[PDB]
């Protein structure tokens, strides 16, 4: 972008909204690309700062959610804390 | 990247797996960033080519899924086909 930012809460309401719309599209585009390149099925659920709902699924949201409920093994599960841990361990790359 | 690639299925098995691991992390990193910048809560559910499950939630998947079941209002819902259409429009 025109200037480097740090990852922290945006307090300006207008900027928050603009950033949300742009980065939401960017996230769905990366999901699309991963789904096609690697033959994945993907769902994404987003609640904004007022808990309005936005969703994406590569093909069919209901199919992905029901497969989730049918899965009965341990699997990779991450949160923001895991992402931060990976960033702390990774190189400047 | 060193070259532009077409968005189509990778048939080389090694390359598919390398690409999957790298881009899965990239997608989760962008989700972390959006969650902090814009004060939102996000979940991701991924089934790979082998039908193995990978998940991410900014804080708690249980809470996101329960809230999802309560939401009644019309809302944005997009699929790959919609993304492809937007990219046509963008040119």
């Amino acid at each position: 972008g025109r200037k480097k930012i740090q990852i922290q809460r945006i307090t300006d309401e207008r900027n928050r909204q603009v950033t949300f719309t742009k980065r939401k599209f960017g996230l769905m585009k990366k999901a699309y690309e991963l789904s096609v390149l690697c033959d994945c099925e993907i769902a994404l659920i987003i609640f904004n700062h007022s808990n309005k709902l936005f969703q994406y699924a590569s093909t069919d949201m209901d199919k992905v959610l029901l497969k989730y409920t049918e899965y009965n093994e341990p699997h990779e599960s991450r949160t923001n804390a895991d992402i931060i841990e990976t960033l702390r361990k990774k190189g400047f790359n | 990247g060193r070259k532009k690639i077409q968005i189509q299925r990778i048939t080389d098995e090694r390359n598919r797996q390398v690409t999957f691991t790298k881009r899965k992390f990239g997608l989760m990193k962008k989700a972390y960033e959006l969650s902090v910048l814009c004060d939102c809560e996000i979940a991701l559910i991924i089934f790979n080519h082998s039908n193995k499950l990978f998940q991410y939630a900014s804080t708690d998947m249980d809470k996101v899924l329960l809230k999802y079941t309560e939401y009644n209002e019309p809302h944005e819902s997009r699929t790959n086909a919609d993304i492809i259409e937007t990219l046509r429009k963008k040119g």
Partner: peptide, 17 residues
Amino acid sequence: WGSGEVKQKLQEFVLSK
């Protein structure tokens, strides 16, 4: 994804549509 109430509620929600 496992035996519990959250799993049950999500399944019911999807199927009722």
